[PDB]
Amino acid sequence: KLLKLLKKLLKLLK
Numbered sequence: 001k002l003l004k005l006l007k008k009l010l011k012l013l014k
C-alpha cells in the first residue's frame with residue numbers, strides 16, 4: 001500500500 005511507501009521514502013532523509 002502507498003502508506004508504507006511513505007516509510008520507504010523517509011529513510012532517504014532521516
